[PDB]
């Protein structure tokens, strides 16, 4: 039962790690989109 508890903790921790990696990858994608948006903003000002 101690191995049982240890394993459960590893599993929950393993999943937590996977989530943090997922969230950071997702953040990177939104930033790239935001960079494209900002470029258009700059072009808009040049158009003005």
């Amino acid at each position: 039962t101690q191995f049982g508890s240890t394993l459960q903790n590893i599993i929950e921790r393993q999943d937590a790690e996977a989530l943090n990696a997922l969230l950071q990858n997702q953040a990177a994608e939104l930033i790239l989109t935001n960079l494209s948006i900002q470029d258009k903003t700059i072009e808009e000002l040049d158009a003005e």
Binding site: I11, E12, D15, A18, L19, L22, Q26, E29, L30
Partner: protein, 49 residues
């Protein structure tokens, strides 16, 4: 916003597919609760002995 929508769905899919999901806990709770109660009756019987 569409990207954010997809990312949100990805997180939901992740929560559903990850091993330590709601289904696991529902199962663990059901099984442990059965054990805990049965163990309790045995514990009471020994306490009474």
């Amino acid at each position: 916003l569409k990207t954010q929508q997809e990312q949100t769905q990805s997180q939901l899919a992740f929560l559903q597919r990850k091993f330590s999901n709601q289904a696991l806990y529902n199962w663990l709770r059901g099984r442990l609760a059965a054990i805990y109660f049965q163990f309790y009756d045995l514990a009471v019987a020994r306490c009474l002995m």
